Point group: D2
Chain length 123, copies 4
Protein backbone atom coordinates (compact mmCIF):
# COMPACT_ATOMS: atom_id res chain seq x y z
CA UNK A 1 0.00 0.00 0.00
CA UNK A 2 1.40 3.57 -0.55
CA UNK A 3 1.38 4.45 3.15
CA UNK A 4 2.97 1.12 4.03
CA UNK A 5 5.76 1.66 1.50
CA UNK A 6 6.43 5.38 2.27
CA UNK A 7 9.23 5.71 4.90
CA UNK A 8 12.92 5.06 5.56
CA UNK A 9 14.29 1.57 4.96
CA UNK A 10 17.76 -0.06 5.51
CA UNK A 11 19.19 -3.32 4.04
CA UNK A 12 21.79 -5.84 5.19
CA UNK A 13 24.72 -3.85 3.82
CA UNK A 14 23.76 -0.70 5.84
CA UNK A 15 22.48 1.31 2.76
CA UNK A 16 19.54 3.83 3.14
CA UNK A 17 16.35 4.02 1.00
CA UNK A 18 13.90 7.02 1.59
CA UNK A 19 10.76 6.78 -0.54
CA UNK A 20 7.35 8.29 -1.09
CA UNK A 21 4.65 6.25 -2.86
CA UNK A 22 2.02 8.35 -4.67
CA UNK A 23 -1.66 7.58 -5.36
CA UNK A 24 -0.98 6.99 -9.07
CA UNK A 25 1.42 3.95 -8.51
CA UNK A 26 4.57 6.21 -8.42
CA UNK A 27 7.68 5.92 -6.17
CA UNK A 28 10.20 8.79 -5.79
CA UNK A 29 13.10 9.31 -3.30
CA UNK A 30 16.86 9.11 -2.62
CA UNK A 31 19.23 6.17 -1.99
CA UNK A 32 22.59 6.15 -0.12
CA UNK A 33 24.80 3.00 -0.57
CA UNK A 34 27.19 1.72 1.97
CA UNK A 35 29.40 0.07 -0.63
CA UNK A 36 30.69 0.75 -4.12
CA UNK A 37 31.84 3.72 -6.12
CA UNK A 38 29.25 5.95 -4.50
CA UNK A 39 29.01 8.87 -2.10
CA UNK A 40 26.10 11.06 -0.80
CA UNK A 41 22.60 10.61 -2.08
CA UNK A 42 21.26 9.69 -5.50
CA UNK A 43 17.70 10.21 -6.87
CA UNK A 44 15.43 7.19 -7.48
CA UNK A 45 12.17 6.75 -9.38
CA UNK A 46 10.04 3.55 -9.67
CA UNK A 47 6.50 2.20 -9.74
CA UNK A 48 4.34 -0.14 -7.58
CA UNK A 49 1.49 -2.42 -8.60
CA UNK A 50 -1.42 0.33 -6.28
CA UNK A 51 -4.07 -2.37 -6.26
CA UNK A 52 -2.37 -5.58 -5.00
CA UNK A 53 -4.55 -8.67 -4.40
CA UNK A 54 -6.40 -9.55 -0.49
CA UNK A 55 -4.85 -11.83 0.32
CA UNK A 56 -1.56 -12.45 2.11
CA UNK A 57 0.26 -11.70 -1.30
CA UNK A 58 2.99 -9.12 -1.54
CA UNK A 59 2.74 -5.94 -3.60
CA UNK A 60 5.15 -6.08 -6.53
CA UNK A 61 7.33 -3.00 -7.19
CA UNK A 62 10.62 -1.90 -8.71
CA UNK A 63 12.89 1.23 -8.82
CA UNK A 64 16.09 2.52 -10.47
CA UNK A 65 19.16 4.56 -9.37
CA UNK A 66 21.71 5.88 -12.01
CA UNK A 67 24.88 6.36 -10.05
CA UNK A 68 25.67 9.95 -10.97
CA UNK A 69 25.22 13.03 -8.67
CA UNK A 70 27.25 16.30 -8.07
CA UNK A 71 30.05 14.47 -6.38
CA UNK A 72 30.55 11.19 -8.35
CA UNK A 73 29.79 9.58 -11.71
CA UNK A 74 30.24 5.72 -11.67
CA UNK A 75 28.68 5.11 -15.16
CA UNK A 76 26.34 2.45 -13.88
CA UNK A 77 22.68 1.94 -12.94
CA UNK A 78 21.03 -0.61 -10.67
CA UNK A 79 17.37 -1.76 -10.81
CA UNK A 80 15.70 -3.60 -7.85
CA UNK A 81 12.61 -5.85 -8.54
CA UNK A 82 10.72 -7.38 -5.58
CA UNK A 83 7.67 -7.39 -3.32
CA UNK A 84 6.49 -5.49 -0.29
CA UNK A 85 5.15 -7.60 2.56
CA UNK A 86 3.53 -5.45 5.29
CA UNK A 87 2.55 -6.32 8.85
CA UNK A 88 4.26 -5.35 12.10
CA UNK A 89 7.69 -6.21 10.66
CA UNK A 90 7.35 -4.98 7.10
CA UNK A 91 9.93 -6.02 4.58
CA UNK A 92 10.72 -5.47 0.87
CA UNK A 93 12.48 -8.59 -0.60
CA UNK A 94 14.38 -7.98 -3.86
CA UNK A 95 16.79 -9.21 -6.52
CA UNK A 96 18.78 -6.59 -8.44
CA UNK A 97 20.78 -6.09 -11.66
CA UNK A 98 23.75 -3.61 -11.70
CA UNK A 99 24.89 -2.76 -15.26
CA UNK A 100 28.12 -0.75 -15.92
CA UNK A 101 28.63 0.97 -19.32
CA UNK A 102 31.29 -1.00 -21.29
CA UNK A 103 32.84 -1.28 -24.78
CA UNK A 104 31.14 -3.98 -27.04
CA UNK A 105 34.07 -6.29 -26.40
CA UNK A 106 33.49 -6.41 -22.61
CA UNK A 107 29.72 -6.30 -22.63
CA UNK A 108 29.64 -10.02 -21.59
CA UNK A 109 30.79 -8.88 -18.08
CA UNK A 110 28.70 -5.74 -17.68
CA UNK A 111 26.00 -7.02 -15.27
CA UNK A 112 26.18 -8.15 -11.61
CA UNK A 113 23.14 -9.84 -9.98
CA UNK A 114 22.33 -9.99 -6.23
CA UNK A 115 19.55 -9.79 -3.66
CA UNK A 116 18.76 -7.33 -0.86
CA UNK A 117 16.22 -7.39 1.95
CA UNK A 118 15.04 -4.04 3.40
CA UNK A 119 13.62 -3.42 6.92
CA UNK A 120 11.43 -0.39 7.61
CA UNK A 121 12.39 1.97 10.40
CA UNK A 122 9.01 2.87 11.78
CA UNK A 123 9.13 5.09 13.81
CA UNK B 1 27.30 8.51 -24.59
CA UNK B 2 23.66 9.59 -24.09
CA UNK B 3 21.73 11.41 -26.92
CA UNK B 4 19.26 9.54 -29.16
CA UNK B 5 17.62 7.64 -26.38
CA UNK B 6 14.44 9.62 -26.90
CA UNK B 7 12.18 7.89 -29.44
CA UNK B 8 10.16 4.72 -30.18
CA UNK B 9 11.97 1.42 -29.80
CA UNK B 10 10.83 -2.19 -30.41
CA UNK B 11 12.28 -5.48 -29.08
CA UNK B 12 12.41 -9.06 -30.49
CA UNK B 13 8.95 -9.95 -29.07
CA UNK B 14 7.35 -6.98 -30.89
CA UNK B 15 6.83 -4.87 -27.77
CA UNK B 16 6.86 -0.99 -28.07
CA UNK B 17 8.90 1.30 -25.73
CA UNK B 18 8.27 5.10 -26.20
CA UNK B 19 10.64 7.22 -24.06
CA UNK B 20 11.83 10.80 -23.41
CA UNK B 21 15.22 11.37 -21.73
CA UNK B 22 15.46 14.70 -19.78
CA UNK B 23 18.84 16.53 -19.56
CA UNK B 24 19.37 15.70 -15.84
CA UNK B 25 19.19 11.82 -16.06
CA UNK B 26 15.42 11.13 -16.00
CA UNK B 27 13.46 8.77 -18.34
CA UNK B 28 9.62 8.91 -18.75
CA UNK B 29 7.21 7.29 -21.32
CA UNK B 30 4.88 4.36 -22.04
CA UNK B 31 5.36 0.57 -22.74
CA UNK B 32 3.07 -1.87 -24.57
CA UNK B 33 3.95 -5.64 -24.31
CA UNK B 34 3.26 -8.06 -27.19
CA UNK B 35 3.07 -11.00 -24.68
CA UNK B 36 1.71 -11.86 -21.25
CA UNK B 37 -1.21 -10.82 -19.11
CA UNK B 38 -1.09 -7.24 -20.47
CA UNK B 39 -2.94 -4.95 -22.92
CA UNK B 40 -2.64 -1.39 -24.22
CA UNK B 41 -0.15 1.03 -22.60
CA UNK B 42 1.46 1.24 -19.19
CA UNK B 43 3.47 4.04 -17.52
CA UNK B 44 7.23 3.66 -17.14
CA UNK B 45 9.79 5.75 -15.22
CA UNK B 46 13.61 5.27 -15.04
CA UNK B 47 17.04 6.94 -14.97
CA UNK B 48 20.21 6.93 -17.16
CA UNK B 49 23.77 7.94 -16.23
CA UNK B 50 24.92 10.84 -18.41
CA UNK B 51 28.71 10.76 -18.92
CA UNK B 52 28.61 8.16 -19.57
CA UNK B 53 32.38 7.86 -19.88
CA UNK B 54 35.99 8.34 -24.15
CA UNK B 55 36.54 4.60 -24.49
CA UNK B 56 33.34 4.40 -26.60
CA UNK B 57 31.22 2.72 -23.95
CA UNK B 58 27.48 2.49 -23.57
CA UNK B 59 25.40 4.65 -21.34
CA UNK B 60 23.93 2.76 -18.36
CA UNK B 61 20.17 3.05 -17.71
CA UNK B 62 17.14 1.25 -16.28
CA UNK B 63 13.35 1.60 -15.97
CA UNK B 64 10.30 0.11 -14.32
CA UNK B 65 6.72 -0.81 -15.40
CA UNK B 66 4.06 -1.96 -12.83
CA UNK B 67 1.52 -3.99 -14.86
CA UNK B 68 -1.58 -2.23 -13.77
CA UNK B 69 -3.58 0.20 -15.95
CA UNK B 70 -7.34 0.76 -16.59
CA UNK B 71 -7.66 -2.55 -18.51
CA UNK B 72 -5.66 -5.04 -16.43
CA UNK B 73 -3.79 -5.52 -13.20
CA UNK B 74 -1.42 -8.50 -13.38
CA UNK B 75 0.05 -7.85 -9.87
CA UNK B 76 3.58 -7.82 -11.10
CA UNK B 77 6.32 -5.36 -12.13
CA UNK B 78 9.32 -5.65 -14.44
CA UNK B 79 12.62 -3.78 -14.24
CA UNK B 80 15.05 -3.62 -17.23
CA UNK B 81 18.77 -2.81 -16.58
CA UNK B 82 21.18 -2.31 -19.51
CA UNK B 83 23.10 0.15 -21.65
CA UNK B 84 22.46 2.25 -24.77
CA UNK B 85 24.92 2.20 -27.66
CA UNK B 86 24.15 4.85 -30.32
CA UNK B 87 25.55 5.13 -33.81
CA UNK B 88 24.23 4.02 -37.16
CA UNK B 89 22.33 1.13 -35.60
CA UNK B 90 21.50 2.16 -32.03
CA UNK B 91 20.67 -0.53 -29.56
CA UNK B 92 19.62 -0.81 -25.93
CA UNK B 93 20.75 -4.28 -24.69
CA UNK B 94 18.98 -5.31 -21.40
CA UNK B 95 18.36 -8.14 -18.83
CA UNK B 96 15.10 -7.95 -16.85
CA UNK B 97 13.49 -9.27 -13.68
CA UNK B 98 9.71 -9.85 -13.59
CA UNK B 99 8.39 -10.31 -10.00
CA UNK B 100 4.71 -11.31 -9.35
CA UNK B 101 3.22 -10.79 -5.87
CA UNK B 102 2.90 -14.24 -4.21
CA UNK B 103 2.18 -15.60 -0.81
CA UNK B 104 5.19 -16.58 1.34
CA UNK B 105 4.77 -20.25 0.38
CA UNK B 106 5.36 -19.40 -3.26
CA UNK B 107 7.97 -16.72 -2.88
CA UNK B 108 10.71 -19.12 -4.14
CA UNK B 109 9.16 -19.01 -7.67
CA UNK B 110 8.05 -15.29 -7.79
CA UNK B 111 10.75 -14.07 -10.21
CA UNK B 112 11.48 -14.66 -13.94
CA UNK B 113 14.73 -13.38 -15.58
CA UNK B 114 15.19 -12.77 -19.32
CA UNK B 115 16.90 -10.49 -21.84
CA UNK B 116 15.60 -8.07 -24.50
CA UNK B 117 17.36 -6.11 -27.27
CA UNK B 118 15.61 -2.93 -28.55
CA UNK B 119 16.07 -1.13 -31.93
CA UNK B 120 14.15 1.70 -33.60
CA UNK B 121 13.35 -0.64 -36.46
CA UNK C 1 38.16 -27.91 0.18
CA UNK C 2 36.82 -31.40 -0.86
CA UNK C 3 36.53 -32.66 2.72
CA UNK C 4 34.85 -29.44 3.80
CA UNK C 5 32.30 -29.70 0.99
CA UNK C 6 31.58 -33.47 1.31
CA UNK C 7 28.57 -34.06 3.64
CA UNK C 8 24.83 -33.47 4.04
CA UNK C 9 23.50 -29.93 3.70
CA UNK C 10 19.99 -28.35 4.12
CA UNK C 11 18.68 -24.95 2.88
CA UNK C 12 15.98 -22.55 4.06
CA UNK C 13 13.18 -24.37 2.24
CA UNK C 14 13.99 -27.72 3.99
CA UNK C 15 15.53 -29.40 0.85
CA UNK C 16 18.43 -31.96 1.21
CA UNK C 17 21.80 -31.94 -0.66
CA UNK C 18 24.21 -35.00 -0.17
CA UNK C 19 27.52 -34.55 -1.99
CA UNK C 20 30.97 -36.01 -2.40
CA UNK C 21 33.80 -33.80 -3.71
CA UNK C 22 36.59 -35.72 -5.50
CA UNK C 23 40.30 -34.90 -5.79
CA UNK C 24 39.95 -33.91 -9.46
CA UNK C 25 37.49 -30.94 -8.79
CA UNK C 26 34.36 -33.19 -9.21
CA UNK C 27 31.06 -33.12 -7.21
CA UNK C 28 28.53 -35.99 -7.36
CA UNK C 29 25.43 -36.77 -5.19
CA UNK C 30 21.63 -36.62 -4.83
CA UNK C 31 19.20 -33.75 -4.10
CA UNK C 32 15.69 -33.91 -2.53
CA UNK C 33 13.51 -30.72 -2.84
CA UNK C 34 10.91 -29.71 -0.39
CA UNK C 35 8.93 -27.78 -2.98
CA UNK C 36 7.94 -28.08 -6.62
CA UNK C 37 6.98 -30.82 -9.02
CA UNK C 38 9.43 -33.22 -7.43
CA UNK C 39 9.47 -36.38 -5.33
CA UNK C 40 12.27 -38.71 -4.03
CA UNK C 41 15.87 -38.14 -4.94
CA UNK C 42 17.50 -36.87 -8.12
CA UNK C 43 21.17 -37.26 -9.23
CA UNK C 44 23.46 -34.20 -9.32
CA UNK C 45 26.87 -33.58 -10.88
CA UNK C 46 29.01 -30.38 -10.63
CA UNK C 47 32.53 -29.04 -10.26
CA UNK C 48 34.48 -26.95 -7.69
CA UNK C 49 37.40 -24.59 -8.22
CA UNK C 50 40.11 -27.58 -5.95
CA UNK C 51 42.74 -24.91 -5.43
CA UNK C 52 40.92 -21.85 -3.99
CA UNK C 53 43.03 -18.85 -2.88
CA UNK C 54 44.53 -18.39 1.24
CA UNK C 55 42.91 -16.20 2.15
CA UNK C 56 39.48 -15.76 3.71
CA UNK C 57 37.96 -16.14 0.09
CA UNK C 58 35.27 -18.67 -0.64
CA UNK C 59 35.72 -21.61 -3.00
CA UNK C 60 33.56 -21.16 -6.10
CA UNK C 61 31.47 -24.14 -7.27
CA UNK C 62 28.32 -25.05 -9.16
CA UNK C 63 26.08 -28.15 -9.80
CA UNK C 64 23.04 -29.25 -11.84
CA UNK C 65 19.90 -31.37 -11.24
CA UNK C 66 17.59 -32.40 -14.21
CA UNK C 67 14.27 -33.07 -12.59
CA UNK C 68 13.58 -36.53 -13.94
CA UNK C 69 13.84 -39.84 -11.95
CA UNK C 70 11.78 -43.15 -11.87
CA UNK C 71 8.84 -41.50 -10.24
CA UNK C 72 8.49 -38.03 -11.90
CA UNK C 73 9.53 -36.07 -14.99
CA UNK C 74 9.06 -32.24 -14.58
CA UNK C 75 10.91 -31.27 -17.85
CA UNK C 76 13.12 -28.77 -16.10
CA UNK C 77 16.68 -28.38 -14.79
CA UNK C 78 18.12 -26.09 -12.14
CA UNK C 79 21.77 -24.95 -11.84
CA UNK C 80 23.18 -23.43 -8.58
CA UNK C 81 26.31 -21.14 -8.75
CA UNK C 82 27.92 -19.94 -5.50
CA UNK C 83 30.77 -20.17 -3.00
CA UNK C 84 31.69 -22.39 -0.09
CA UNK C 85 32.78 -20.60 3.07
CA UNK C 86 34.17 -23.03 5.68
CA UNK C 87 34.83 -22.55 9.39
CA UNK C 88 32.85 -23.84 12.36
CA UNK C 89 29.55 -22.82 10.73
CA UNK C 90 30.20 -23.67 7.10
CA UNK C 91 27.84 -22.36 4.50
CA UNK C 92 27.38 -22.51 0.70
CA UNK C 93 25.73 -19.25 -0.59
CA UNK C 94 24.13 -19.50 -4.05
CA UNK C 95 21.95 -17.99 -6.76
CA UNK C 96 20.14 -20.39 -9.11
CA UNK C 97 18.43 -20.54 -12.52
CA UNK C 98 15.49 -22.99 -13.08
CA UNK C 99 14.67 -23.45 -16.79
CA UNK C 100 11.51 -25.37 -17.94
CA UNK C 101 11.31 -26.72 -21.53
CA UNK C 102 8.81 -24.54 -23.50
CA UNK C 103 7.57 -23.89 -27.07
CA UNK C 104 9.45 -20.98 -28.87
CA UNK C 105 6.46 -18.73 -28.25
CA UNK C 106 6.71 -19.01 -24.43
CA UNK C 107 10.47 -19.14 -24.14
CA UNK C 108 10.44 -15.55 -22.71
CA UNK C 109 9.00 -17.04 -19.45
CA UNK C 110 11.06 -20.22 -19.21
CA UNK C 111 13.54 -19.21 -16.46
CA UNK C 112 13.03 -18.46 -12.72
CA UNK C 113 15.92 -16.97 -10.67
CA UNK C 114 16.41 -17.22 -6.87
CA UNK C 115 18.95 -17.70 -4.10
CA UNK C 116 19.51 -20.45 -1.52
CA UNK C 117 21.79 -20.69 1.49
CA UNK C 118 22.86 -24.18 2.67
CA UNK C 119 23.98 -25.18 6.22
CA UNK C 120 26.12 -28.27 6.78
CA UNK C 121 24.92 -30.90 9.21
CA UNK C 122 28.18 -31.95 10.77
CA UNK C 123 27.90 -34.38 12.54
CA UNK D 1 13.12 -33.67 -27.43
CA UNK D 2 16.70 -34.81 -26.73
CA UNK D 3 18.88 -36.34 -29.56
CA UNK D 4 21.53 -34.25 -31.37
CA UNK D 5 22.91 -32.66 -28.27
CA UNK D 6 26.13 -34.59 -28.72
CA UNK D 7 28.59 -32.61 -30.86
CA UNK D 8 30.66 -29.39 -31.09
CA UNK D 9 28.81 -26.14 -30.53
CA UNK D 10 29.98 -22.49 -30.65
CA UNK D 11 28.41 -19.36 -29.11
CA UNK D 12 28.37 -15.64 -30.15
CA UNK D 13 31.70 -14.92 -28.35
CA UNK D 14 33.46 -17.70 -30.32
CA UNK D 15 33.72 -20.12 -27.41
CA UNK D 16 33.74 -23.95 -28.12
CA UNK D 17 31.52 -26.46 -26.22
CA UNK D 18 32.20 -30.20 -27.03
CA UNK D 19 29.66 -32.51 -25.33
CA UNK D 20 28.43 -36.14 -25.16
CA UNK D 21 24.92 -36.87 -23.86
CA UNK D 22 24.53 -40.38 -22.29
CA UNK D 23 21.15 -42.21 -22.56
CA UNK D 24 20.30 -41.78 -18.83
CA UNK D 25 20.48 -37.90 -18.62
CA UNK D 26 24.22 -37.23 -18.17
CA UNK D 27 26.36 -34.64 -20.07
CA UNK D 28 30.23 -34.76 -20.16
CA UNK D 29 32.84 -32.89 -22.33
CA UNK D 30 35.22 -29.91 -22.53
CA UNK D 31 34.78 -26.07 -22.87
CA UNK D 32 37.20 -23.46 -24.23
CA UNK D 33 36.29 -19.73 -23.66
CA UNK D 34 37.21 -17.02 -26.19
CA UNK D 35 37.17 -14.37 -23.39
CA UNK D 36 38.23 -13.88 -19.78
CA UNK D 37 40.96 -15.15 -17.51
CA UNK D 38 40.98 -18.56 -19.25
CA UNK D 39 43.03 -20.60 -21.76
CA UNK D 40 42.87 -24.00 -23.44
CA UNK D 41 40.26 -26.56 -22.31
CA UNK D 42 38.36 -27.12 -19.09
CA UNK D 43 36.23 -30.07 -17.90
CA UNK D 44 32.45 -29.72 -17.81
CA UNK D 45 29.74 -31.99 -16.34
CA UNK D 46 25.92 -31.52 -16.44
CA UNK D 47 22.50 -33.16 -16.85
CA UNK D 48 19.53 -32.91 -19.29
CA UNK D 49 15.91 -33.99 -18.78
CA UNK D 50 14.97 -36.64 -21.35
CA UNK D 51 11.23 -36.50 -22.16
CA UNK D 52 11.38 -33.84 -22.53
CA UNK D 53 7.64 -33.49 -23.13
CA UNK D 54 4.42 -33.50 -27.72
CA UNK D 55 3.89 -29.75 -27.71
CA UNK D 56 7.25 -29.34 -29.51
CA UNK D 57 9.13 -27.96 -26.52
CA UNK D 58 12.82 -27.79 -25.80
CA UNK D 59 14.71 -30.18 -23.64
CA UNK D 60 15.91 -28.62 -20.36
CA UNK D 61 19.60 -29.00 -19.42
CA UNK D 62 22.49 -27.36 -17.55
CA UNK D 63 26.24 -27.77 -16.96
CA UNK D 64 29.13 -26.47 -14.91
CA UNK D 65 32.78 -25.45 -15.57
CA UNK D 66 35.20 -24.60 -12.67
CA UNK D 67 37.90 -22.37 -14.25
CA UNK D 68 40.91 -24.26 -13.09
CA UNK D 69 43.10 -26.45 -15.33
CA UNK D 70 46.91 -26.96 -15.71
CA UNK D 71 47.38 -23.47 -17.23
CA UNK D 72 45.19 -21.20 -15.08
CA UNK D 73 43.05 -21.06 -12.00
CA UNK D 74 40.69 -18.06 -12.07
CA UNK D 75 38.93 -19.07 -8.78
CA UNK D 76 35.51 -18.95 -10.31
CA UNK D 77 32.89 -21.28 -11.82
CA UNK D 78 30.09 -20.74 -14.34
CA UNK D 79 26.79 -22.60 -14.62
CA UNK D 80 24.63 -22.44 -17.80
CA UNK D 81 20.87 -23.29 -17.57
CA UNK D 82 18.72 -23.47 -20.73
CA UNK D 83 17.00 -25.69 -23.27
CA UNK D 84 17.93 -27.45 -26.54
CA UNK D 85 15.72 -27.08 -29.61
CA UNK D 86 16.73 -29.44 -32.45
CA UNK D 87 15.64 -29.35 -36.06
CA UNK D 88 17.24 -27.90 -39.14
CA UNK D 89 18.98 -25.20 -37.13
CA UNK D 90 19.51 -26.60 -33.63
CA UNK D 91 20.11 -24.19 -30.83
CA UNK D 92 20.84 -24.30 -27.12
CA UNK D 93 19.59 -20.96 -25.61
CA UNK D 94 21.07 -20.29 -22.10
CA UNK D 95 21.45 -17.76 -19.20
CA UNK D 96 24.53 -18.17 -16.99
CA UNK D 97 25.85 -17.20 -13.56
CA UNK D 98 29.61 -16.64 -13.09
CA UNK D 99 30.62 -16.57 -9.37
CA UNK D 100 34.22 -15.66 -8.30
CA UNK D 101 35.41 -16.55 -4.78
CA UNK D 102 35.56 -13.29 -2.75
CA UNK D 103 35.99 -12.31 0.83
CA UNK D 104 32.80 -11.54 2.80
CA UNK D 105 33.28 -7.79 2.27
CA UNK D 106 33.01 -8.25 -1.48
CA UNK D 107 30.39 -10.94 -1.61
CA UNK D 108 27.76 -8.41 -2.84
CA UNK D 109 29.61 -8.16 -6.22
CA UNK D 110 30.74 -11.85 -6.63
CA UNK D 111 28.27 -12.80 -9.38
CA UNK D 112 27.86 -11.82 -13.08
CA UNK D 113 24.77 -12.90 -15.12
CA UNK D 114 24.63 -13.12 -18.93
CA UNK D 115 23.16 -15.11 -21.81
CA UNK D 116 24.68 -17.24 -24.59
CA UNK D 117 23.18 -18.89 -27.69
CA UNK D 118 25.05 -21.93 -29.14
CA UNK D 119 24.89 -23.36 -32.72
CA UNK D 120 26.96 -26.01 -34.51
CA UNK D 121 28.00 -23.38 -37.03
O1 LIG E 1 29.57 0.88 -7.56
C1 LIG E 1 28.67 1.29 -8.28
O2 LIG E 1 28.57 1.09 -9.48
C2 LIG E 1 27.57 2.15 -7.63
C3 LIG E 1 27.17 1.63 -6.25
C4 LIG E 1 26.43 0.31 -6.38
C5 LIG E 1 25.90 -0.10 -4.98
C6 LIG E 1 25.14 -1.47 -5.11
S1 LIG E 1 23.52 -1.43 -5.84
C7 LIG E 1 23.22 -3.10 -5.20
C8 LIG E 1 23.92 -3.29 -3.84
N1 LIG E 1 23.00 -2.82 -2.84
C9 LIG E 1 23.46 -1.73 -2.20
O3 LIG E 1 22.83 -1.14 -1.30
N2 LIG E 1 24.67 -1.38 -2.65
C10 LIG E 1 25.11 -2.26 -3.73
O1 LIG F 1 2.22 -11.12 -17.73
C1 LIG F 1 2.62 -10.22 -17.00
O2 LIG F 1 2.96 -10.38 -15.84
C2 LIG F 1 2.67 -8.78 -17.57
C3 LIG F 1 3.34 -8.71 -18.94
C4 LIG F 1 4.84 -9.06 -18.85
C5 LIG F 1 5.52 -8.93 -20.28
C6 LIG F 1 7.06 -9.20 -20.15
S1 LIG F 1 8.10 -8.02 -19.25
C7 LIG F 1 9.58 -8.75 -19.97
C8 LIG F 1 9.27 -9.29 -21.40
N1 LIG F 1 9.53 -8.23 -22.35
C9 LIG F 1 8.40 -7.78 -22.93
O3 LIG F 1 8.34 -6.93 -23.84
N2 LIG F 1 7.33 -8.38 -22.41
C10 LIG F 1 7.69 -9.45 -21.51
O1 LIG G 1 9.35 -27.86 -9.95
C1 LIG G 1 10.32 -28.20 -10.63
O2 LIG G 1 10.51 -27.87 -11.79
C2 LIG G 1 11.36 -29.12 -9.98
C3 LIG G 1 11.63 -28.75 -8.52
C4 LIG G 1 12.38 -27.43 -8.45
C5 LIG G 1 12.78 -27.17 -6.98
C6 LIG G 1 13.54 -25.79 -6.89
S1 LIG G 1 15.23 -25.77 -7.48
C7 LIG G 1 15.46 -24.18 -6.65
C8 LIG G 1 14.64 -24.12 -5.34
N1 LIG G 1 15.47 -24.71 -4.32
C9 LIG G 1 14.97 -25.85 -3.83
O3 LIG G 1 15.52 -26.53 -2.95
N2 LIG G 1 13.81 -26.15 -4.43
C10 LIG G 1 13.45 -25.16 -5.44
O1 LIG H 1 37.42 -14.98 -16.42
C1 LIG H 1 36.97 -15.95 -15.82
O2 LIG H 1 36.52 -15.92 -14.68
C2 LIG H 1 36.97 -17.32 -16.54
C3 LIG H 1 36.42 -17.25 -17.96
C4 LIG H 1 34.92 -16.90 -17.96
C5 LIG H 1 34.36 -16.87 -19.45
C6 LIG H 1 32.82 -16.62 -19.43
S1 LIG H 1 31.71 -17.87 -18.75
C7 LIG H 1 30.29 -17.06 -19.51
C8 LIG H 1 30.72 -16.38 -20.85
N1 LIG H 1 30.55 -17.34 -21.93
C9 LIG H 1 31.73 -17.73 -22.44
O3 LIG H 1 31.86 -18.48 -23.43
N2 LIG H 1 32.75 -17.20 -21.78
C10 LIG H 1 32.30 -16.22 -20.80
Amino acid sequence: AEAGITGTWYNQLGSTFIVTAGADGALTGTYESAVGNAESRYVLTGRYDSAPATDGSGTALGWTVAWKNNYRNAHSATTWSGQYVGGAEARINTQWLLTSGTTEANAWKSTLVGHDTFTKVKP
